[PDB]
Amino acid sequence: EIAQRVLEEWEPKTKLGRLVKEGQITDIHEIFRKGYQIKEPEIVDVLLPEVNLRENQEVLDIALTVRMTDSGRRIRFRVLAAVGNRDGYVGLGIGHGREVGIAIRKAINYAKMNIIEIKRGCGSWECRCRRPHSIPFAVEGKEGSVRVKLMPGPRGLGLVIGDVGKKILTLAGVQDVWSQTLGETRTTVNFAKAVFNALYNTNRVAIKPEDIERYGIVVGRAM
RNA sequence: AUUCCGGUUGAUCCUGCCGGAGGCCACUGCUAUGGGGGUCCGACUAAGCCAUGCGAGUCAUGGGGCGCGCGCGCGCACCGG
Ligand SMILES: [Zn+2]
């Protein structure tokens, strides 16, 4: 379809982009757990073509900030945006501009560059299935004054959390969760970053080879 | 649904309080077709005052006796329980 449409008019600037364009890197999971740097959004546009669909591109927050000069007030726009494959890959970005379209575009680019993969499972006392509809164990996240704690829930319990957390977890591929919070949750940037870090910290919990089949743990895409 | 949103600045992050948004009880405005079930209706102020009528009686196989009809049968009150 549009693979030859996105790959033909792109000239790589970095070495990872060249590796991807030649064809030696072929799956999304081969770019993560090395010390690789990602400085091109076309890498992710090639390896995850689904992040380009407009239904996977939630725009979260738009703010208008002012800088004083003796002439007048200089206005700037700040846009916090979210991107994600709905099967375990998420990204969060912030973009500034002298107008709104420039800021939105820069936010989506920086969201594509900040892509992470997460782990999923069941882990609940009340469901005990082995299907990756939630997170497999409770996790913590912090940002500024905001603290977030996520806990696994049973099937059909849909996303008991604020709306920013709702959208981020929906772009993550998670469907059931309980939550607790502390701090200035009315500041959208800090709440969003704390939930992002909570989702990241699923990779920081040590597990034994017997837990992967008890909780149905899946790393990245499922099936 | 183990949930958040608005408000102190030229703009920002915090603390902290006020408000919204849910449910139950009492008074109340506008409006109102029909059935069923139920442990609903002068409790909050004055456990303030009350006109009238009803809310506790029964036994004639405990006793004597009066009346009405043919010793018997019906009825009334009295003593007694
Ligand atoms: Zn489950």
From Swiss-Prot:
Keywords noted in UniProt: Metal-binding, Ribonucleoprotein, Ribosomal protein, RNA-binding, rRNA-binding, Zinc
Binding positions for Zn(2+) per the UniProt entry: 122, 127, 129, 133
Family statement drawn from the similarity comment of this UniProt entry: Belongs to the universal ribosomal protein uS5 family.
Primary role: With S4 and S12 plays an important role in translational accuracy.
InterPro entries tied to this protein: Ribosomal_Su5_D2-typ_SF, Ribosomal_uS5, Ribosomal_uS5_arc, Ribosomal_uS5_C, Ribosomal_uS5_euk/arc, Ribosomal_uS5_N, Ribosomal_uS5_N_CS, Ribsml_uS5_D2-typ_fold_subgr
PROSITE patterns the record matches: RIBOSOMAL_S5 (PS00585), S5_DSRBD (PS50881)
Cofactor(s) demanded: Zn(2+)
SUPFAM superfamilies, sorted: dsRNA-binding domain-like (SSF54768), Ribosomal protein S5 domain 2-like (SSF54211)
Entry note: cofactor: Binds 1 Zn(2+) ion per subunit.
Name of the featured protein: Small ribosomal subunit protein uS5
Pfam families, per database record: Ribosomal_S5, Ribosomal_S5_C
Any single Gene Ontology cellular-component annotation: cytosolic small ribosomal subunit
Domain comment, as recorded: The N-terminal domain interacts with the head of the 30S subunit; the C-terminal domain interacts with the body and contacts protein S4. The interaction surface between S4 and S5 is involved in control of translational fidelity.
Subunit structure: Part of the 30S ribosomal subunit. Contacts protein S4.
One GO term of the biological process aspect: translation
GO terms for MF: metal ion binding; rRNA binding; structural constituent of ribosome
Regions annotated as coiled coil: none
Sequence ranges assigned to domain S5 DRBM in this UniProt record: 55-118
Organism domain of life: Archaea
